[PDB]
Amino acid sequence: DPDPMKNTCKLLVVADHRFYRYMGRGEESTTTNYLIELIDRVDDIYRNTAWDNAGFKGYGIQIEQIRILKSPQEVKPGEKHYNMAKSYPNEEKDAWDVKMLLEQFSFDIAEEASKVCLAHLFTYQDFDMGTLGLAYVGSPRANSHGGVCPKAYYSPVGKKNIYLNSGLTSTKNYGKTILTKEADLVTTHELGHNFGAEHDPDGLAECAPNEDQGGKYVMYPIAVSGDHENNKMFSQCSKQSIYKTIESKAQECFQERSN
Ligand SMILES: CC#CCOc1ccc(S(=O)(=O)N2CCSC(C)(C)[C@@H]2C(=O)NO)cc1
Ligand SMILES: [Zn+2]
C-alpha cells in the first residue's frame, strides 16, 4: 500500500533562455506559471494512474525548485553549456543533437540534480526528425544509473559525479509551437521513461490499440495526437515496468505530497 510520506517525485524544472523567450514571452512569472500548470496537468495523469490496476495509486510529481534562465550562458572558444546561446555540435542548426543536449544538461545540473528525484529541462529547439523529447530510463535496480532517484557516477573526463535522473522536453516542432495538450504528453512520456517505461510494443494489441478501442498509449514510439482516449494514459506494458520501479525507488527518493 502506498506510503503517504513517500508518494511524490519532486522536480527540478529548468527553463533555459529559449523557452523563457519564446514560450514565456520574456516574462519570468509567465514562464513559471506555464510550467507550474504543465507539471500540474502531468501530475493529474500520474496521480490518477493505478500501476497495479487496483490501489497502487496516488503517485505523482511536484516541483521542488523552478529555475528560469532569463539569459544564455556565455561561452568562449572550445567550451560548451546546455543553456549557452549557440547550439552544439552544429552552429548552423536551430537545435542541438538531442542526445548531446541531455548529456550536457545532466553534467551542468549535476550539483542541483543530486538533491532531487528528477531534473527536467524545458527548451524551445527544433530537433531533427520530429524529435520532441528525451530522457533516461529508470529501473528498480539500486545501481541503475538513469531515471528516478539520484545515483552518482564519477565522470573521469567531467572531473566530477553525475546523475542521470533527467530528461527534457521541447515545445517547438516543424518550425512551430506544439499544442499545449501535445506538450503535456511529451513531458508525461519522458517522465514515463524516467519512471521506468520503455516504448510500447507497437504490434501488441493490448498495449497499442486501434483508434476504435481508444488509440495508442502515451509510451507509443511515434508522437500521439492527444485526440484519443488512451493517448493520456499508461498501457499495461508501461504499468508493469513503472510499478516495479516505484515499488523499489519510492522508499529511496520519493517525498510527501505538498499542498
Ligand atoms: C505529442 C506526444 C507525445 C508522447 O511523447 C513523446 C515524446 C517524444 C517522442 S519523439 O521525440 O518523437 N521520439 C520517438 C522515437 S525514439 C526518440 C528517442 C527519437 C524519441 C523518444 O521516444 N523520446 O523519448 C514521441 C512521443
Ligand atoms: Zn520515448
What b/e sequence results for 205-226 when a residue is b if at least 16 CB atoms lie within 10 Å of its CB, and e otherwise? Answer: eebbbeeeeebbbbbbeebbeb
Which residue, 142, 151, 141, is CA-closest to 119?
151
Residue 232 to residue 223: CA distance in whole angstroms: 12
Residue 99 to residue 134: CA distance in whole angstroms: 7
- Cell 496516488 appears where? 58
| 77 CA from centroid of ligand 2 (Å) | 33
Which residue, 151, 245, 229, 143, is CA-closest to 193?
245
Strand partners, 220: none
CB of residue 131 inside a 6 A radius of ligand 1? yes
Solved using: X-ray
Nearest CA owner, ligand 1 atom 12: 131
Resolution of this entry, Å: 2.3
- Would you call the peptide bond into 2 cis, given omega within 30 degrees of 0 as the criterion? no
Q: In this structure, how many other beta carbons lie within 10 angstroms of the beta carbon of residue 150?
A: 22
- Cell 528516478 appears where? 148
| 219 CA from centroid of ligand 2 (Å) | 6
**What secondary structure does DSSP assign to 140-208, as a single string?**
SSSS--SSSS---EEETTTTEEE---EEEEE-EETTEEPPHHHHHHHHHHHHHHHTTPPPP-TT-TTTS
CB of residue 221 inside a 6 A radius of ligand 1? yes
| Residues 258/10, Cβ–Cβ less than 8 Å | no
Which residue, 153, 237, 223, 163, is CA-closest to 190?
223
How far, in Å, are 50, 51, 70, 179, 219 from residue 25 at the CA level?
Answer: 37, 38, 11, 16, 31
Q: Is 193 annotated as a binding residue?
A: yes
Looking at the chain, list the stretches that DSSP marks H as alpha helix, in order from N- to C-terminal side. Answer: 17-22, 28-47, 98-108, 110-113, 180-194, 236-253
Containing structural domain, residue 13: 1-259
What cell does 213 get? 478501442
What cell does 203 get? 504490434
The CA-based angle 140-141-146, given to 5 degrees, is 80
The CA-based angle 104-144-118, given to 5 degrees, is 50
Q: What CATH number is associated with residue 202? A: 3.40.390.10
How far, in Å, are 38, 57, 66, 112 from residue 243 at the CA level?
Answer: 23, 10, 27, 27
Number of domains the chain is built from: 1
| 243 CA from centroid of ligand 1 (Å) | 21
